Design a protein around this ligand. Structure first.
Ligand SMILES: CCCCCCCC/C=C/CCCCCCCC(=O)O[C@@H](COC(=O)CCCCCCCCCCCCCCC)COP(=O)([O-])OCC[N+](C)(C)C
Ligand SMILES: CCCCCCCC/C=C/CCCCCCCC(=O)O[C@@H](COC(=O)CCCCCCCCCCCCCCC)COP(=O)([O-])OCC[N+](C)(C)C
Ligand SMILES: CCCCCCCC/C=C/CCCCCCCC(=O)O[C@@H](COC(=O)CCCCCCCCCCCCCCC)COP(=O)([O-])OCC[N+](C)(C)C
Ligand SMILES: CCCCCCCC/C=C/CCCCCCCC(=O)O[C@@H](COC(=O)CCCCCCCCCCCCCCC)COP(=O)([O-])OCC[N+](C)(C)C
Ligand SMILES: CCCCCCCC/C=C/CCCCCCCC(=O)O[C@@H](COC(=O)CCCCCCCCCCCCCCC)COP(=O)([O-])OCC[N+](C)(C)C
Ligand SMILES: CCCCCCCC/C=C/CCCCCCCC(=O)O[C@@H](COC(=O)CCCCCCCCCCCCCCC)COP(=O)([O-])OCC[N+](C)(C)C
Ligand SMILES: CCCCCCCC/C=C/CCCCCCCC(=O)O[C@@H](COC(=O)CCCCCCCCCCCCCCC)COP(=O)([O-])OCC[N+](C)(C)C
Ligand SMILES: CCCCCCCC/C=C/CCCCCCCC(=O)O[C@@H](COC(=O)CCCCCCCCCCCCCCC)COP(=O)([O-])OCC[N+](C)(C)C
Ligand SMILES: CCCCCCCC/C=C\CCCCCCCC(=O)O[C@@H](COC(=O)CCCCCCCCCCCCCCC)COP(=O)([O-])OCC[N+](C)(C)C
Ligand SMILES: CCCCCCCC/C=C\CCCCCCCC(=O)O[C@@H](COC(=O)CCCCCCCCCCCCCCC)COP(=O)([O-])OCC[N+](C)(C)C
Ligand SMILES: CCCCCCCC/C=C\CCCCCCCC(=O)O[C@@H](COC(=O)CCCCCCCCCCCCCCC)COP(=O)([O-])OCC[N+](C)(C)C
Ligand SMILES: CCCCCCCC/C=C\CCCCCCCC(=O)O[C@@H](COC(=O)CCCCCCCCCCCCCCC)COP(=O)([O-])OCC[N+](C)(C)C
Lengths: 226, 226, 226, 226
């Protein structure tokens, strides 16, 4: 009565192949003409692929010793979430708010990183180094917030474009920490009006960079040790 | 008569929570309409928060064994400086020179990194690696100064914008070492007139980069060792 | 009857010198006037250099113990491929499709990295670290594909320039991961129309960067170990 | 009769202080008005500083055991070269070709890195890692040359600006390897005409980057070892 043996060689291979085909079709469908000429087929195949993933994860669930740890392990929670999101897409297909709904029709491909064990191990390892660089991110958040607040009150009425709110300015402070056109297009047109403005960026760009550098190093000599 | 026990669990927790609320309100206040509609409340809460921080640091001072090392430790000096700067803001509120005065109303949030011990330890560690990369910064300063002097006499009358003074040119030499639009907007419009100008940037961008790279490495294989 | 001894000191030296001269002439020939004034000489020297390389590699082949491992080693396969490509150039000289044919007249210089042993060892070592960073590249490919698909359906009709197809958009997603004008010229003119668009880039630029950082580290603490 | 003892504490201190003052004055002199109003003083002080450096290095020479190794050590050769260059400036002051002559009036400050021993040791160490990354630079040179040649024949008549010669194009290939506006301003206006052009940059920007990354790593795990 118990479901004892369920696993075999292609038990995954077929799933990953199917996911690849899913990616292929969901990519193709993004062409206006080709999609607009064969819509019934795309409809039917999307439905059937949805149902395959559904019955797949359900098969694993039922044959995963329910009362013991299946929903206890996070990976399967992630799989389940992905399938539920595809279902949300389906059963709430096209009321109106579809623009940010068709998108979820895509991420069903990234469950690839769940099935192939090497990618699973790699991604879990990558996440396991997030609590390593924990504090540094808090420091960087403090830094960003302080500088955003300081900017939005200084340059509010000289550059409404970049420094207009605490939200909008929290953008200009991001595309500057990445050293992206921070001089000729963020500063030179401001530094022209308020001449003492430079002390802002030349400070931020400095200290920000420093922190980032150290953050990077903080990880490097952590894997030499572990 | 002596103040023996003063510490407990929330002895910090309440302070850091209050600081968070301080950040929240000082952020909100940067909206023109919302601040302009409820100013009395913002006034009163700013005053009361100021007084809370004041009585807090004073409590620590009095219950910090005055004659022994309290003002001897630098962190408390930093705290005291921050509180005094907020006070400078208050008692010298709005004579006229307020533009660069309201700013100090902000950095009172960064004393967060003082109170939570993990951030304190991290920041102290980060500073402790400044005397490590001591010389390299002297070398980089020499380099910057030399190249600024060399530029301002060559391109003074062909590009008044970027190379106009030893000060202004010390900017163009900064937004070039960060590889920010150094070619199409700093050089191509100059390289057009003085054709041999390229040897300037292609030298600087080279050597500067080299130094920086080495500086970075100079830190990396210093934490593998310590 | 067997070819026993074939090697000596300059056995390579002459070849690398000749290759250097080949580079020199193939570089010179890219000037319109100078090439257009002495074409017969360039013709004849190109022919003779081709034949020198031909007889060279053929000499090695015949005096490389044919039945045993000569074509078994990959380097010689690469050499042979290069010579055959030069020959393809010659015997299929100028039917019409020459634009992407004259190019192969160039890469015959890079066989330099085959002959000088230090470069050979270095390049082989560099390649030997490709299977090291194997998975991370698969993860990055998945990431790129997902984000390209997600972009091309959102911004298809607001920015036909950058996001027009799954191909063209796979470019805009490349010159953004390199942080090249990703804000002022890829996003600000889009973020103006669809205001919620920022969550796209600020996500990608984030996660992409993270992956890349880790990839880099994944190699660093792999040479400390091997 | 022999010069036995010549060294003492300030034997350097005075020299480095004087060099600092030299930097200060040579910087000041770059202002048009201020220099144009007091020229006699600047003249006389430049002359006297020149003579101080002269007599200084000559003192060291004579009291450096001439027949034994003084000119044998490279640092003193560098010092001597710098002083001779200042002298070239003086005795060949203003015939006409002064534009690239006043410049040498500057680098006399960088002899600072000779006198202060910490900087001397650091700079010598930095140079001692140039023969470490020897081959990689040869590989990068090969790469640059190949791609420059390949570009200048493809895009010669569609973008005369960037790809016009083997020299000029060797610039556009430099401000692209640094990821500086390589997409929106080097490629998009070219990729519009020759549509298959992308395979150029997306290749170069790829492989170049790879090499650079590896070069960096090639140094990192060389100081963990030495
Ligand atoms: C394991 C999970 C990872 C996922 C990896 C991906 C796995 C699955 C990959 C799936 C790829 C998706 C395929 C979609 C292409 C459909 C063909 C097409 O559109 O032709 C179009 C033409 O267009 C052309 O002329 C050229 C078509 C090739 C461009 C495809 C780019 C490659 C994407 C690869 C991305 C690689 C991702 C990595 C990137 C670093 C037709 O439309 P049209 O404009 O009307 O032209 C009319 C032509 N006609 C006259 C003949 C009618
Ligand atoms: C790990 C986390 C680390 C956190 C560290 C983060 C550090 C925070 C970084 C803060 C950056 C500072 C930004 C302020 C500079 C811009 C000001 C400006 O431009 O306005 C005016 C400059 O008016 C002046 O004269 C100011 C001259 C220098 C003031 C320096 C301010 C230092 C603030 C305290 C320093 C505290 C130091 C530290 C304290 C402990 C411009 O002129 P105006 O008056 O507006 O006149 C009208 C405009 N008009 C000119 C067109 C007519
Ligand atoms: C531990 C110390 C670290 C500090 C961390 C921060 C801790 C404290 C954080 C404090 C955050 C500050 C809150 C201020 C927002 C007030 C609400 C508001 O302005 O609404 C405005 C609307 O605006 C909107 O429509 C959207 C509002 C959300 C934008 C807030 C950005 C989040 C900042 C988070 C930064 C994260 C920092 C990290 C970033 C990496 C109302 O103004 P209006 O334009 O007139 O609109 C009219 C609307 N009405 C019709 C209803 C009237
Ligand atoms: C760790 C710290 C390391 C420090 C190292 C830092 C190194 C310092 C780096 C210095 C960079 C050098 C910058 C100078 C190049 C630009 C000059 C120029 O463009 O002007 C002229 C070029 O006129 C020429 O013909 C010059 C040709 C090459 C001269 C090379 C100068 C080397 C100086 C000595 C080298 C010393 C080497 C080292 C010595 C020990 C332009 O033409 P024009 O004459 O003006 O004519 C009028 C304009 N017109 C054309 C429109 C009509
Ligand atoms: C080991 C394998 C690695 C390969 C390494 C390379 C090894 C082999 C290197 C080969 C180099 C190729 C030489 C070609 C130059 C020919 C001379 C010429 O064109 O003169 C032109 C003038 O142009 C000038 O005025 C200046 C010429 C010097 C520019 C050459 C750039 C150096 C390229 C080095 C690249 C270094 C690569 C590294 C870069 C990091 C003449 O044409 P014109 O316009 O009509 O002028 C008329 C003048 N006239 C009046 C006198 C008639
Ligand atoms: C290692 C690999 C890691 C892979 C991770 C990769 C993660 C993937 C990253 C995906 C990035 C997400 C991009 C979507 C954001 C842009 C949407 C947009 O702008 O359209 C609309 C926003 O409409 C809204 O109101 C949306 C508000 C936020 C929605 C957030 C979407 C999250 C999707 C699920 C999150 C799943 C989380 C994870 C699930 C497990 C714009 O407005 P409009 O509706 O079009 O109205 C008409 C236009 N008009 C405004 C001009 C009138
Ligand atoms: C150890 C070796 C390493 C070398 C390190 C350097 C050591 C030696 C450093 C020497 C520094 C050189 C000093 C030159 C300044 C002269 C004063 C001046 O020009 O005033 C001008 C005004 O200009 C101003 O209004 C502000 C002047 C300060 C700008 C100086 C920038 C600091 C350079 C520091 C670079 C730091 C390098 C590091 C950078 C990272 C006057 O000219 P004017 O325009 O006509 O104004 C009229 C005013 N008036 C009405 C009163 C008349
Ligand atoms: C460590 C050192 C490593 C060294 C590695 C360095 C590798 C070297 C990297 C070289 C980069 C390659 C650059 C060439 C691509 C651009 C060509 C182009 O755009 O012209 C044409 C594309 O015409 C085509 O149809 C070409 C289609 C793809 C050809 C691929 C070329 C591969 C060359 C061999 C590959 C060898 C692989 C390796 C061999 C061993 C454009 O069209 P048109 O024909 O001009 O028509 C007229 C213009 N019109 C369109 C406006 C009307
Ligand atoms: C916190 C970082 C600062 C560093 C200080 C270092 C010394 C800083 C030197 C001088 C500082 C003060 C100069 C006096 C001028 C002040 C006001 C002024 O006139 O501004 C003038 C220029 O403003 C500049 O020139 C900014 C200088 C950029 C510094 C880049 C240093 C990079 C450090 C290297 C990092 C690597 C090593 C890192 C080692 C730490 C502009 O105003 P104006 O001339 O009156 O003209 C009117 C305005 N107008 C232009 C719109 C028309
Ligand atoms: C110090 C670094 C230099 C490196 C030298 C290497 C060889 C350098 C090769 C040739 C050097 C000399 C060429 C002769 C031309 C001189 C004058 C000239 O005519 O300029 C011409 C172009 O100027 C250029 O082309 C600059 C070349 C950029 C070099 C990029 C190398 C990157 C090294 C790779 C780094 C990685 C490996 C690093 C390994 C170290 C322009 O003048 P014009 O043509 O007469 O036209 C009139 C002016 N006009 C354009 C405004 C209309
Ligand atoms: C996934 C990453 C997100 C991070 C969230 C963090 C908090 C994010 C805070 C607030 C989030 C939501 C704000 C409410 C506004 C939503 C809609 C909106 O109005 O947009 C508004 C602005 O949009 C922005 O301001 C984007 C904020 C950029 C975030 C940069 C954070 C960098 C993290 C640091 C990385 C280092 C540490 C990393 C630690 C992880 C624009 O719309 P509008 O105002 O209505 O005006 C009409 C549109 N118009 C402009 C075209 C005219
Ligand atoms: C060597 C690197 C290549 C990689 C291949 C990967 C798959 C490449 C996918 C498809 C390749 C071929 C697509 C078919 C189109 C060919 C011709 C064409 O039409 O071009 C079209 C677009 O051209 C592009 O879209 C270029 C795609 C950029 C690739 C970015 C991948 C980054 C790798 C990630 C690095 C990280 C991981 C690294 C893992 C290695 C434009 O031509 P058109 O549409 O006809 O319109 C007319 C021209 N017009 C626009 C001027 C009007």
């Amino acid at each position: 009565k118990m479901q004892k043996i369920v696993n075999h060689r292609a038990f995954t291979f077929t799933v990953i192949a199917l996911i690849l085909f899913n990616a292929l079709i969901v990519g193709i469908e993004t062409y206006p003409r080709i999609y607009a000429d064969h819509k019934w087929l795309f409809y039917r195949i999307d439905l059937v692929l949805l149902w395959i993933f559904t019955i797949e994860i359900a098969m694993r669930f039922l044959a995963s010793n329910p009362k013991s740890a299946f929903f206890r392990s996070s990976w399967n929670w992630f799989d389940f979430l992905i399938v539920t999101l595809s279902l949300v897409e389906l059963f709430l297909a096209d009321v109106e708010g579809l623009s940010v709904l068709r998108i979820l029709r895509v991420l069903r491909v990234l469950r690839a990183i769940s099935v192939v064990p090497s990618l699973r191990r790699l991604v879990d390892a990558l996440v396991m180094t997030i609590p390593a660089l924990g504090n540094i991110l808090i420091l960087m958040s403090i830094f960003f917030y302080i500088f955003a607040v300081i900017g939005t009150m200084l340059f509010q009425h000289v550059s409404p474009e970049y420094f207009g709110n605490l939200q909008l300015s929290l953008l200009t402070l991001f595309q500057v920490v990445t050293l992206e056109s921070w001089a000729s297009g963020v500063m030179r047109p401001i530094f022209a009006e308020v001449p003492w403005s430079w002390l802002y960026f030349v400070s931020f760009v400095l200290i920000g960079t420093f922190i980032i550098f150290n953050l990077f190093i903080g990880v490097i000599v952590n894997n030499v040790e572990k």
